[PDB]
Structure formats: structure tokens, C-alpha cells
Design a protein around this ligand. Structure first.
Ligand SMILES: CC(C)CCC[C@@H](C)[C@H]1CC[C@H]2[C@@H]3CC=C4C[C@@H](OC(=O)CCC(=O)O)CC[C@]4(C)[C@H]3CC[C@]12C
Ligand SMILES: CC(C)CCC[C@@H](C)[C@H]1CC[C@H]2[C@@H]3CC=C4C[C@@H](OC(=O)CCC(=O)O)CC[C@]4(C)[C@H]3CC[C@]12C
Ligand SMILES: CC(C)CCC[C@@H](C)[C@H]1CC[C@H]2[C@@H]3CC=C4C[C@@H](OC(=O)CCC(=O)O)CC[C@]4(C)[C@H]3CC[C@]12C
Ligand SMILES: CC(C)CCC[C@@H](C)[C@H]1CC[C@H]2[C@@H]3CC=C4C[C@@H](OC(=O)CCC(=O)O)CC[C@]4(C)[C@H]3CC[C@]12C
Ligand SMILES: CC(C)CCC[C@@H](C)[C@H]1CC[C@H]2[C@@H]3CC=C4C[C@@H](OC(=O)CCC(=O)O)CC[C@]4(C)[C@H]3CC[C@]12C
Ligand SMILES: *SC[C@@H]1NC(=O)c2csc(n2)[C@H](C)NC(=O)c2csc(n2)[C@H](C)NC(=O)c2csc1n2
Ligand SMILES: Nc1ncnc2c1ncn2[C@@H]1O[C@H](COP(=O)(O)OP(=O)(O)OP(=O)(O)O)[C@@H](O)[C@H]1O
Ligand SMILES: Nc1ncnc2c1ncn2[C@@H]1O[C@H](COP(=O)(O)OP(=O)(O)OP(=O)(O)O)[C@@H](O)[C@H]1O
Ligand SMILES: [Mg+2]
Ligand SMILES: [Mg+2]
Length: 1177
């Protein structure tokens, strides 16, 4: 329906809308009512009040009185203008404030419930829809709903009230003439309706394009590190630019439709005027009407017609809001099958850990032609440990996901204590299960707050106990702020092992009955793995654990071990029995602040399209000056009309004025369309350019910039969209009409001046008082613009953090907590909106009241002028019309002050991002680019401290050397700085002391893009894009077009080609967001292929085999050994099997080197390396 919105009105918002509509009706009819009650000079309101001479014999006494009686009438009308002005003050304040309050409350509820619809969806829903658009929706569509259900509805109702009041006055003075002119009401209405429907469709398409553009920006900014490492800034900007172009085209179409609607309305009105004079000239010839009769009905219908003509932007805003309310309410109305918010379902008192998987058949929703499990059967007894082993992609993580009811199996049963889990309450089932995922993800908050996400009502003592069990106490105590040290998005400001241990503690603070641990020790060293294993063993008896580990040391002591082959368990049993059977387990085990000109400079960025601007200015001047010139030309029109010579022939011969009104309608159509279309196209080009430049500037910035807690994905994505939209809100047709109004005021100045100069001083006085309300509102609103921008950045941060990490939120049952945080983040903008409602209501009220007071003052001063014979009554009526139009112009400019307020704050910020220069500039062409590279990498006394934690020494005089054909093995404990070396070699940061040399040349002198071009890195937690497999390997070289054969060769070297070939759609298969749609090993192998397709001279691996099986690791090692010569390789490994083949191994701890040499040399001495290899054995 059209009215899907206003669903969350409630009684208070209904009462606001009803009383505001009543106030709008009263305010609209109050001007018709004045002329209805008082009509003796309403006939005079037809200018050139015909006196029919009578001045030949004016007694100067008969003349005298006449002027005194006329003065008395003007004074009475001035008093009534003052009274109507006070009434207008009250009713206009009510009309604006009530509608704004209702819109604000409804928008607050809409945002809250749209957030409580994304959190309610299933994981399968998230695996099919592009959820990277959703935040843009929350930032944009709702805002466009806010712009179409507030003040605009009241304004439209006021215009309608003026329309009906004017037509009621005509009916009183001429039923037939009014009925014929009213014949354009249905055609005008249908025109408005069709244009509104087209506007709604175009708005829906444009918002879809903007949502797609926001999704690219969400993916790229969340993966800026991969984007910078592989130099994909140009490609990621082209991807953004494509959706920017689509949105610009749709917006240009929107501008065309809206302005042709405006022009068509004005053309219809002017054609109706010509029809009115036609039929009235008939009524006069046939003698059934007088001239006064046709003039009055005209003045009465004209005001309402022009009010409706001016009401078109309100209809456009309503159409845009209804177009924006499509996807939001579509997502809201969607009801999941697995409802985590449902209260139904059994919550058994005594959950004994009896887990059964019976004939489990499952296929993922995104890839539903692939069978992952084919009659999986597995029984886990209370207090027992099952260890799931097998090849990568077999379905172990799928089984873990099915245990926590992330999906429902197509066939089979998952049961606890013999009870089917689809009948258990979803939330209750999930709280009794604690899960550590294959690649743990933290949240952008403190360590303690991250732990509290496992269980909200947790004390500091139990947090300490859990982090001691997780072997996390030591490093948390070591860095300052203790538990209050905030980590980055997804835990990026911690080492991989630290993040994994934090996740372990977060799962442990739940005291779960079912502990799922999927590769929970992949980022840990031998000591941390051993101590965490012992801590878990000390608590096994009370709970049941399902553990999946590619490190076969942990599964040695498991009570039962189950092997996956072909989607089923082929061998289940203990270690000794499986070794006796010599099955797949045996095979696995053997193979071992605000400048005020900011808007001016943003518009100066729009200088290329100056011809559009000049055409729009000319059109705005034409229509704005024709608005008051209407009174003058009708004065001349009235002149001849009233003049009667021959009775019938010449009166009908005066059809030239119907032609004049037709020409005026054509000119109005052309000028309104031109002005609006040119300004809207200029605004579309400007907003697209601003988004392009801001996104390019963000991709230019350093890694340290992205590590700033204020610069989070959600914050950045909100900042970009919000600044572009806020600047756009003060440009386009909104700007165009402003120029028109200036022209109007200018014309009002000249028409008065050529007709009477005494009344011009009244305009010169009343402009300041009608603009003081605007400037004081511009002030009040300017500071809360900054405040609301800062709060909306945090709201977007919370929303994006919840969306990008929805699986973690669902596993932790933290959807309600994130909803509470989102609601809290909305409170300050909500209260600011509620107070802005009253501020805008008072501003509009004061403006209209001073307009009416200006009319009263005009009538009184004109009475003085007429009494002293200084000026005539025809002149005081023409100029009074000029004063009315000038007051309108000043009032509308003052109403533009809120739009410009947001624009200037946003401009001062768009200008700054754009002019910001990073220290390590990746766009700079400067820098020495060596013609040859020999692969000699040296670190000399490198000292580095991370910008977000500058007081913690990370590397202290680190020195190392690696040459071509040599393999450097970085080993050591978690947090020692192994990944920091790789990040420094990529020049993500610059060390304060020491140097990094490439072939004897210090790396800060080399070109940054050139230096990164010869680096091929596999990261510790590899990130892929939601793009094809082939597109992901090809990101390994963005400079050239990578061929299909090269991609296939890289995949074969990465031992991933067979999976891609077997999978339907092959290399065109989309992986999901950050490799969600592939197993950890498959994702890591695709990352390896991405790094290898580049054929780098320097290959940096950061635990590149953590998620790989023994066979896959062997294949990758053989592939690397085949190409061992011809490049230099630096490997970070927690597995001694890969390390023992390295040419040289260095043990780095606390940023220093302790032991270095070959495997035999390190083994000879009983040092750290010997201790590690002995504890492993
Ligand atoms: C052309 C544009 C510029 C103005 C359109 C004016 C009317 C067509 C609209 C404006 C406000 C609307 C009203 C705003 C709110 C409501 C409450 C709404 O209530 C619900 O939808 C309740 C649903 C629920 O409780 O679940 C019913 C329609 C109604 C009366 C709407 C009827 C149609 C109205 C008068
Ligand atoms: C009682 C006197 C004083 C005024 C009478 C006015 C009517 C003759 C006019 C006013 C508004 C007009 C309506 C305004 C808009 C539309 C929608 C229009 O269809 C569309 O453009 C879209 C249809 C849709 O979206 O469903 C069809 C004509 C209609 C009903 C119009 C029919 C004629 C109406 C009722
Ligand atoms: C007719 C003349 C005499 C003017 C009458 C003015 C009233 C109609 C105004 C003035 C103060 C207004 C109130 C000022 C502030 C608020 C709080 C506001 O609360 C919110 O929705 C935000 C806070 C929250 O709920 O978190 C709701 C509207 C309300 C009651 C306003 C309702 C309309 C009021 C009573
Ligand atoms: C909307 C407002 C703030 C803009 C400016 C308003 C003035 C231009 C209005 C406000 C009150 C008006 C005055 C109200 C009453 C009088 C007294 C009146 O005095 C006489 O008749 C004097 C006769 C004599 O002694 O000769 C002359 C007009 C005047 C000054 C009016 C002139 C126009 C005034 C100054
Ligand atoms: C920035 C703020 C302070 C502006 C406030 C404006 C109002 C205080 C002014 C604007 C127009 C004024 C009115 C303009 C003209 C008249 C007619 C005037 O008539 C006479 O003086 C009649 C004398 C006679 O003939 O006996 C009486 C004051 C009055 C109502 C004025 C009352 C004060 C008003 C409402
Ligand atoms: S009807 C031709 C012309 N009026 C307009 O163009 C017009 C657009 S919007 C509008 N008038 C609003 C609804 N009018 C007023 O606010 C208003 C208050 S007093 C007044 N207009 C005086 C009586 N108008 C004129 O003298 C006049 C002559 S032509 C004209 N308006
Ligand atoms: N969300 C998903 N959508 C579609 N397919 C998926 C999804 N998640 C996993 N898959 C696919 O299901 C299969 C099994 O994946 P799963 O994560 O269960 O394997 P695994 O045994 O845990 O692997 P690994 O040892 O690499 O961690 C793979 O082919 C994988 O690509
Ligand atoms: N972006 C960052 N901001 C601040 N501190 C960081 C950041 N990244 C890492 N650190 C810190 O720097 C230290 C070294 O981390 P690093 O990632 O280099 O270790 P590592 O040897 O690779 O660890 P692991 O074996 O756990 O992967 C740790 O104390 C870590 O918390
Ligand atoms: Mg897995
Ligand atoms: Mg690391």
C-alpha cells in the first residue's frame, strides 16, 4: 500500500497529525475567509479599481469625504490583518510543529524497528542478500521518509485549504464561472499523481543504486588493508564510480520528472485562466454577469490555483518518501522461520549433554545444488569430548553451525537429550552453547566489554578467571589500560593469538553445557595451546565439547574421534582404535572549525557546468520577476476589459488576452522546467563528484588513519553518505528557487519604485525582520548539526558492527544488546529533532505573522498616503501586491537557512578530507623505481610503536637479513611482532628508528606502489571480496588483466583448482562477504593463489597454512619448493614442519632476536627453539 508508513503512528502521533492538519486548514482558509467576510474592497483587490471618472465635478468636499471613508476602510482592514496575523502565528506554529513532531517520532520508531528486523533474520537470509547495502538503507531511506511525512504534508494541506477557500469565494460571486475553472482540478490532480508515481519509481531505483554504492564502500573500507596491500585503490574507486553514475542518471531522470510536473501544473493553471476569461466574456456578452463579477471570481480562484502550483515540491517529497519506504518495510515485514526473538519453545531445566545427529542432509541456501552432508550421523554422550577430523571442506564447520541452529537441515534431526532442537526455544538453545569460530571476530570496544558479550551479567572476578583459563591474563596485564584497552574493528589491533584467546575467554564466561571449538588454537603457539588445552581439560566433566582441530596433538586425548569423508563420518572411535583400523585418521597422523565560505568552495568545485547555472539563473529570474509583474499586466488587462466601446464585437475580439495567458503558460512551463532541471542536473553532477572525491581521499589515507577509533567502517560509511546528502540538500532546485525569490524581491523593489517610492521603505524595513528569524534559526541549528553528525557516525558504527559480524552476534545471542546500543545512539539526534520541530515551527510562525503585519502596515501607510493625495488607490494596490510577493520571497529564503546550515558544516568537512595528505602517500608518482630487483631485504635496528598504542614498545632494534633464494622463518610467541615485520615491509607504518632496505636502498625513498607491487602477501586472517573466485585471484595484479590460464595455474599451485572445478559455476562462484561462503582452508588457499598469481619477488606468508590440511599443506609446500629459487620468501609459522625446511630461522620475542641459524644449529643449543620442538614432541 501507499500507507505502509504511518503504521507506527500511535494515538499521540495520530492526534498530532489531526490537529496539525486542522491548523493547516485554518491557516489556508484564513486568507480566503478575510475576503469572504469583507468583499467591498475585495472587488477593489481587482487593481485599477474603476472609478468611472466622476472627477470632473469632484467637490473637494465630496472628494474629501470619499478619501476619509476609504482611509477608514483601509484602517479597519489593517486591524483585521493584525488579528489574522496573530491567528496565523498560532495556527502556523501548530501546523509545522505538530507534523514535525509526528514525523520525528514515527521515524524514530521506524529506525528502531528496521534495526529490529535485520537482527531477526536468519544466517541463510544473510547469505543470499547483500547486507552491505542495509546500513545505507538505515542512513538514507529513512531520512527520505523523514522528508516526506513532516512539514511537507502540513504545507500541502495548507495549500489545499487555500485552493478550496478561493473556489468557495468564487462560487459565492459566480457559480457557473467557478465551476468551469474548477474543471482543471481533476486534470491537475491526475497530472500530479502520475508524476508522483514516476518520481516514486525513480526514487526506488536511485536508492537501490545508492545502496549498491554503499556496499562497495563497506567491503573496501573493511578490507582497506588487503586493498592497499594489493594496490586496488583504482579498481575499488571504479566500482564505486559505476554505482555513482547509475545513481546520477536516476537522479537526473528524477529532476526531469519533478520539474516537468511543476511546469505542467503552471501551464494548466495559466490555461485555466484563459478559459476563465473566455467563458466570462461570454457571460458578459449574454448579460448574465457583470465585469466585477468576472474579476472577483478570477481573483478568488487565482490565489488557490497558485497555491496548488507552489505545493508541488511537497507532493514530490511525499512521492520520494513513499518510494523510500519500499525496501525498509519489505525487510521489516519478512518473518524468519528460525525466530531467535520468539518466546515459544521448550526450555528444559536439566540439559544433559546428549547430542545426536541423525541422517543429517544439508545444502547451503547460497549454494543449494551442492550436498555438504549426506546422512551425517554422530552421537555425543554427556561429559564426553568428540574431535572432528577430516579434509578441508568436508563439513565440520557446517556441523558446528547446524548444532547451534544457524540453519535447518533438509533431512534428519539434531537432538539434545533425545528432544528435537527445532522445538527448543532458539535463544535458550543458543545461550547454553558457547562457540569459538574458526577465525574469531571481536568487536570495536574494550577487551572487558568484548568478554561481557559472552555473558552480560559477568563479574570482573569471573572475567579474570576466564582470561586466566584462556592464557590471556599475562598480555592484558602487560599493556596499559588493562581490560579497558579498546581493540579495533574485528580485533585488528590485537595479534591473532591474542584475539583467539580473547574469543576463548568470551566463550568460557558463558559457562556453557555445549562447547563448540572450531580450530580454537590455530593462532596460538605451543605453550599457549598446551595451557589452554589443560585449562579446558580441567573443566570437561561438567560439559560436552565438540572440538575441530587440524593440530592432531589436541585430538590425542579426546574421548572419541570422528573422521569426515564425503559428508559422513566414516570412522568414529578413540585414538588407538582408529590407528588399529588404519583409516583416514591414520593417514592424517602419519603425514606430519567551520569556515563560513565552505559551501562557496564546494560550489566552486561545481564550476565546470556553468552553462547549466546561467540558464537556471535566467529562468529563475524570469519566473521570479513574472510573479509580481502578474499584478501589473493584469492591471493593464483589467483596463481594456472594463473599457467598453462597441457592445459585443470588440469584447469578443479581445481574445488576445486568452492568447496572452496561453503564452504566459508556455513561458512558465519552459522556465520552470529549465530552472529546476538545470539546477538539479548541476546538483547531481556535484554530488557524484563529491562522493567520488571523498571516496578517493579515504582510499588515499594511511593505515594509521583507519586505526583511529573514530575512523571505523560504519563511521566512515555514514560520514561519506551523510556529507554528500547534506550538501546535496542545499543545492539543486532548492537553490534555484532561492535565486528566483531574490529576483522576486528585486522585482518587488522595482515595481514599487516606478509606482511609488514611499512604500518601498516599508519593504526595506520588513526584509530585516523577516530575515532575523532565519538567521537566529541558522545559528541555533548550526551547532546541533555538528552534534547530530557526530552521533549519527556512532549509530552507523553500531549498525555496521552488528551487520558485518551477524554470525557472532547470533551465536552470542547479542542481538538485543546491539539493539539497545543502537537505540541509545539515536537518543541525542532524536531529542535534537524534537527541539528542531519547535524551532522550525516558531520560525515559520514568526515569518508568516510578520508577513501579515507587513500587510497591515502597508494598508495603514497607504491610507496615510491616499489621505494626503500623495499616491492613488490603484498604485497602493499594485505596490501592496509587490510587498506581498517580496515578503514571501524573504520568508522562503529564511526557510532555506536550515538547509544551508547542514551544508556548510558538511562542506567544511568534505573540503578537509579532500585536502588531507597522508604521510605514506600511495597516489604519489614521486619515488625511485629500481629497474632491477635482487630480493635483498634488510632490517637494521627497526624500532616501531603502533599509533593507537604508542606507549607500548613493539620492536626494539630488530635486525634481520634475507637474500634471493633464501627462506626466512620468523618464529616466537604470540604478540612478539612477527606480523608487525610484514606490515612494516609493506610500509603500512614507518618506524621511528632503524631502517628497512630493499637491495641496499632504503624503502622510504622507493615509490610506494612500486614497492608494494613486488610484495606478495598472505595475511594471517585472509579476507576475500563477495565477488567470484576468479575475480579474487585476479586482485593479485590490478595493474594488468589476468588471464584465465594464469588464474587456473595459480589455483593449481594453491591446491584449490579441484574444488573450484567440482563446484558448480566453477570460477564464477561468488564467495560471500570476507570468505563467509567458503571453508577456512578453501579461503586461505584462494588467498595463497591470489598472492601467487602476481609471481612476487618477495613472498610474505603470515601463517599461510593454519587452516590447511596436512595433504594440502604438503601440496602447497611442494609447489613453493618448486619455485624456491628466483624469489625471496619470509614465512611466519607456528608449525615446525614448515619451519624446519627454511634456509634460516630467527626467533623474535619482544621485538628482539634471541636465536638465529638453521634448524640443526637451533636444535643443537637447548634454547627456545629446542624447548618448542621438545614440547611439540
Ligand atoms: C499528497 C501528499 C503531499 C499528502 C497526502 C495527504 C494524505 C493522502 C495523507 C497524509 C497523512 C495521512 C494519514 C496519516 C496517518 C494515518 C494513520 C494510518 O494508520 C495506520 O496505518 C495504522 C496501522 C497499524 O496500526 O498497524 C491510517 C491512515 C492515516 C489516517 C493517513 C491517511 C492519509 C493521509 C491523510
Ligand atoms: C469538490 C470540489 C471543490 C473539488 C473537486 C476536485 C476533484 C474533481 C479532483 C481533486 C483531486 C482529484 C484526484 C487527484 C488524483 C487522482 C489520481 C489519478 O491517478 C493517478 O495519477 C495515479 C493513480 C494511482 O496511483 O492509483 C486519477 C485521478 C485522481 C483520482 C483525481 C480525480 C479528481 C479529483 C478527486
Ligand atoms: C497553542 C499555543 C498556546 C501553543 C501551544 C504549544 C504546545 C502545543 C507545545 C509547547 C511545548 C510542547 C511540548 C514540548 C516537548 C515535548 C516532549 C516531546 O517528547 C519526545 O517525544 C522526546 C523525548 C522522549 O520521549 O524521549 C513530545 C512533545 C512535547 C510533549 C511537546 C508537545 C507540544 C507542546 C505542549
Ligand atoms: C511590520 C512593521 C514592523 C514594518 C514597519 C511598520 C511601519 C511602517 C508602520 C507601523 C505603524 C504605522 C503608523 C501607525 C500610525 C501612524 C500615525 C498617523 O498619524 C497621523 O495621522 C498624523 C496626522 C498629522 O498630525 O498630520 C500617520 C501614519 C502612522 C505614522 C503609521 C505609518 C506606518 C507605520 C509607522
Ligand atoms: C520586530 C518586532 C518588534 C515587530 C513587531 C511588529 C508589530 C508590533 C506591528 C507591525 C504592524 C503594526 C500595526 C500596523 C498598523 C496599525 C494601524 C494603526 O492605526 C492607527 O494608528 C489609527 C489611528 C486613528 O486613525 O485613530 C494602529 C496600530 C497598528 C494596528 C499596528 C500595531 C503594531 C503592529 C502589529
Ligand atoms: S492570483 C495572482 C497573484 N497571486 C499569486 O501569484 C500568489 C501565489 S501564492 C499566493 N498568492 C498566496 C496564497 N497569497 C497570499 O499570501 C496573499 C495575502 S494577501 C494577498 N495575497 C493580496 C490580496 N494579493 C494580491 O493583491 C494579488 C494580485 S495578483 C496576485 N496576488
Ligand atoms: N555460507 C556458506 N555458503 C555456501 N557454502 C558454504 C558456506 N560455508 C561453507 N560452505 C561450503 O561448505 C563446504 C564445507 O565447509 P565447512 O566450513 O563446513 O568445512 P570444514 O570442514 O570446516 O573446513 P576447514 O577444514 O577448511 O575449516 C565447503 O565446500 C564450503 O565452501
Ligand atoms: N593495529 C594495531 N594497533 C595496536 N597494537 C597492535 C596492532 N596490531 C598489533 N598490535 C600489537 O602489537 C604486538 C605485536 O603484534 P603482532 O601482530 O605483530 O604479533 P605476532 O607475532 O604476529 O602475533 P601472533 O603469533 O599472535 O599472530 C601485540 O602486542 C599486538 O597487540
Ligand atoms: Mg571450518
Ligand atoms: Mg600475527
Amino acid at each position: 500500500s501507499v500507507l505502509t508508513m504511518f503504521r507506527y503512528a500511535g494515538w499521540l502521533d495520530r492526534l498530532y497529525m489531526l490537529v496539525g492538519t486542522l491548523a493547516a486548514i485554518i491557516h489556508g482558509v484564513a486568507l480566503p475567509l478575510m475576503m469572504l467576510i469583507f468583499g467591498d474592497m475585495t472587488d477593489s483587490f481587482a487593481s485599477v479599481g474603476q472609478v468611472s471618472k466622476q472627477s470632473t465635478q469632484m467637490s473637494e468636499a465630496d472628494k474629501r469625504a470619499m478619501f476619509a471613508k476609504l482611509e477608514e476602510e483601509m484602517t479597519t482592514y489593517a486591524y483585521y490583518y493584525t488579528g489574522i496575523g496573530a491567528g496565523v502565528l498560532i495556527v502556523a506554529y501548530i501546523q509545522v510543529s505538530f507534523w514535525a513532531l509526528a514525523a520525528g517520532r514515527q521515524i524514530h520508531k521506524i529506525r528502531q524497528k528496521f534495526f529490529h528486523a535485520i537482527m531477526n533474520q536468519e544466517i541463510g537470509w544473510f547469505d543470499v542478500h547483500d547486507v552491505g547495502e542495509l546500513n545505507t538503507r538505515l542512513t538514507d531511506d529513512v531520512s527520505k521518509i523523514n522528508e516526506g511525512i513532516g512539514d511537507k504534508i502540513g504545507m500541502f494541506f495548507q495549500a489545499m485549504a487555500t485552493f478550496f477557500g478561493g473556489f468557495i469565494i468564487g462560487f459565492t460571486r459566480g457559480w457557473k464561472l467557478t465551476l468551469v475553472i474548477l474543471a482543471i482540478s481533476p486534470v491537475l490532480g491526475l497530472s500530479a499523481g502520475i508524476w508522483a508515481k514516476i518520481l516514486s519509481s525513480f526514487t526506488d531505483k536511485e536508492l537501490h543504486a545508492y545502496a549498491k554504492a554503499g556496499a562497495v564502500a563497506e567491503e573496501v573500507l573493511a578490507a582497506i588493508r588487503t586493498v592497499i596491500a594489493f594496490g586496488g585503490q583504482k579498481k575499488e574507486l571504479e566500482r564505486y564510480n559505476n554505482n555513482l553514475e547509475e545513481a546520477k542518471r536516476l537522479g537526473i531522470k528524477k529532476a526531469i520528472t519533478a520539474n516537468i510536473s511543476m511546469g505542467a501544473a503552471f501551464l494548466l493553471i495559466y490555461a485555466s485562466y484563459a478559459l476563465a476569461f473566455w467563458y466570462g466574456t461570454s457571460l458578459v456578452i449574454s448579460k448574465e454577469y457583470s465585469i466585477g463579477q468576472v474579476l472577483t471570481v478570477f481573483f478568488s480562484v487565482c490565489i488557490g490555483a497558485f497555491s496548488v502550483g507552489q505545493a508541488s515540491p511537497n507532493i514530490e517529497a511525499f512521492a520520494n518518501a513513499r518510494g523510500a519506504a519500499y525496501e525498509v518495510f519489505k525487510i521489516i515485514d519478512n518473518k524468519p522461520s528460525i525466530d531467535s526473538f520468539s518466546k515459544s519453545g521448550h526450555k528444559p531445566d536439566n540439559i544433559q549433554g546428549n547430542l545426536e545427529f541423525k541422517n543429517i542432509h544439508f545444502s547451503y541456501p547460497s549454494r543449494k545444488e551442492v550436498q555438504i552432508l549426506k546422512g551425517l550421523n554422530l552421537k555425543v554422550k554427556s561429559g564426553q569430548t568428540v574431535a572432528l577430523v577430516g579434509n578441508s571442506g568436508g563439513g565440520k564447520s557446517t556441523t558446528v553451525q547446524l548444532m547451534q541452529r544457524l540453519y535447518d537441515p533438509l533431512d534428519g534431526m539434531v537432538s539434545i537429550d533425545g528432544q528435537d532442537i527445532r522445538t527448543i526455544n532458539v535463544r535458550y538453545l543458543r545461550e547454553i552453547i558457547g562457540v569459538v569460530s574458526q577465525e574469531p571476530v571481536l568487536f570495536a570496544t574494550t577487551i572487558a566489554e568484548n568478554i561481557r558479550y559472552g555473558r552480560e551479567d559477568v563479574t570482573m572476578d569471573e572475567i579474570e578467571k576466564a582470561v586466566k583459563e584462556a592464557n590471556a591474563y599475562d598480555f592484558i596485564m602487560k599493556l596499559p589500560h588493562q581490560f579497558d584497552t579498546l581493540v579495533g574493528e574485528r580485533g585488528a589491533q590485537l595479534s591473532g593469538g591474542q584475539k583467539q584467546r580473547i574469543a576463548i575467554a568470551r566463550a568460557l564466561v558463558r559457562n556453557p553445557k555445549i562447547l563448540l571449538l572450531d580450530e580454537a588454537t590455530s593462532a596460538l603457539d605451543t605453550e599457549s595451546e598446551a595451557v589452554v588445552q589443560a585449562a579446558l581439560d580441567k573443566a570437561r566433566e561438567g560439559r560436552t565439547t565438540i572440538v575441530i582441530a587440524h593440530r592432531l596433538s589436541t585430538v590425542r586425548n579426546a574421548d572419541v574421534i570422528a573422521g569426515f569423508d564425503g559428508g559422513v563420518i566414516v570412522e568414529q572411535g578413540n585414538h588407538d582404535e582408529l590407528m588399529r583400523e588404519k583409516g583416514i585418521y591414520f593417514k592424517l597422523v602419519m603425514t606430519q572549525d567551520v569556515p563560513p565560505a565552505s559551501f562557496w568552495r564546494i560550489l566552486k568545485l561545481n564550476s565546470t557546468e556553468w552553462p547549466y547555472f546561467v540558464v537556471g539563473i535566467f529562468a529563475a529570474i524570469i519566473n521570479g520577476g513574472l510573479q509580481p509583474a502578474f499584478s501589473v499586466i493584469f492591471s493593464k488587462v483589467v483596463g481594456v476589459f472594463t473599457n467598453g466601446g462597441p457592445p459585443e464585437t470588440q469584447r469578443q475580439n479581445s481574445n488576445l488576452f486568452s492568447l496572452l495567458f496561453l503564452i504566459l503558460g508556455i513561458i512558465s512551463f519552459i522556465t520552470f522546467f529549465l530552472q529546476g532541471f538545470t539546477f538539479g542536473k548541476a546538483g547531481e553532477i556535484l554530488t557524484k563528484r563529491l562522493r567520488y572525491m571523498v571516496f578517493k581521499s579515504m582510499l588515499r589515507q594511511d593505515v594509521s588513519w583507519f586505526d583511529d577509533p573514530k575512523n571505523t567502517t560504519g563511521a566512515l560509511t555514514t560520514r561519506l553518505a551523510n556529507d554528500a546528502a547534506q550538501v546535496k540538500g542545499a543545492t539543486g532546485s532548492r537553490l534555484a528557487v532561492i535565486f528566483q525569490n531574490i529576483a522576486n524581491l528585486g522585482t518587488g523593489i522595482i515595481i514599487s519604485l516606478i509606482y511609488g517610492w514611499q512604500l518601498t521603505l516599508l519593504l526595506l524595513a520588513i526584509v530585516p525582520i523577516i530575515a532575523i528569524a532565519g538567521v537566529v534559526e541558522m545559528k541555533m541549528l548550526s551547532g546541533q548539526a555538528l552534534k547530530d553528525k557526530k552521533e549519527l557516525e556512532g549509530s552507523g558504527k553500531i549498525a555496521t558492527e552488528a551487520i558485518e559480524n551477524f554470525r557472532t552476534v547470533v551465536s552470542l545471542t547479542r542481538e538485543q544488546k546491539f539493539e539497545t546500543m543502537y537505540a541509545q545512539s539515536l537518543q541525542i539526534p532524536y531529542r535534537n529533532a524534537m527541539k528542531k520541530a519547535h524551532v522550525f515551527g516558531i520560525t515559520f510562525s514568526f515569518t508568516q505573522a510578520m508577513m501579515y503585519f507587513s500587510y497591515a502596515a502597508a494598508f495603514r501607510f497607504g491610507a496615510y498616503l491616499v489621505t494626503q493625495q500623495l499616491m492613488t488607490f490603484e498604485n497602493v494596490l499594485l505596490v501592496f501586491s509587490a510587498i506581498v510577493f517580496g515578503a514571501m520571497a524573504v520568508g522562503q529564503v529564511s526557510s532555506f537557512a536550515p538547509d544551508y546550515a547542514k551544508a556548510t558544516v558538511s562542506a567544511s568537512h568534505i573540503i578537509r578530507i579532500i585536502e588531507k595528505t597522508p604521510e605514506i602517500d600511495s597516489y604519489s608518482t614521486q619515488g625511485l623505481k629500481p629497474n632491477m630487483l635482487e630480493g635483498n631485504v634488510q632490517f637494521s635496528g627497526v624500532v616501531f610503536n603502533y599509533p593507537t598504542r604508542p606507549s607500548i614498545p613493539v620492536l626494539q632494534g630488530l635486525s634481520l637479513e634475507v637474500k634471493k633464494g633464501q627462506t626466512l622463518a620468523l618464529v616466537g610467541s604470540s604478540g612478539g611482532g612477527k606480523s608487525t615485520v610484514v606490515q612494516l615491509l609493506e610500509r603500512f607504518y614507518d618506524p621511528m628508528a632503524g631502517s628497512v632496505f630493499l637491495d641496499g636502498k632504503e624503502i622510504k625513498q622507493l615509490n610506494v606502489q612500486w614497492l608494494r607491487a613486488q610484495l606478495g602477501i598472505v595475511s594471517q586472517e585472509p579476507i576475500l571480496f563477495d565477488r567470484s573466485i576468479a575475480e579474487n585471484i585476479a586482485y593479485g595484479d590490478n595493474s594488468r588483466v589476468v588471464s584465465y590460464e594464469e588464474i587456473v595455474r595459480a589455483a593449481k599451485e594453491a591446491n584449490i583448482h579441484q574444488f573450484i572445478d567440482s563446484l558448480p559455476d566453477k570460477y564464477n562462484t561468488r564467495v560471500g562477504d570476507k570468505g563467509t561462503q567458503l571453508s577456512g582452508g578453501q579461503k586461505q588457499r584462494i588467498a595463497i593463489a591470489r598472492a601467487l598469481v602476481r609471481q612476487p619477488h618477495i613472498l610474505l606468508l603470515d601463517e599461510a597454512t593454519s587452516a590447511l590440511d596436512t595433504e594440502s599443506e604438503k601440496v602447497v609446500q611442494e609447489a613453493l619448493d618448486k619455485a624456491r629459487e628466483g624469489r625471496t620468501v619470509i614465512v611466519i609459522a607456528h608449525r615446525l614442519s614448515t619451519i624446519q625446511n627454511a634456509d634460516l630461522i630467527v626467533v623474535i620475542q619482544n621485538g628482539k632476536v634471541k636465536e638465529h641459524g638453521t634448524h640443526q644449529q637451533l636444535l643443537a643449543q637447548k634454547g627456545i627453539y629446542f624447548s618448542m620442538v621438545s614440547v611439540q614432541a
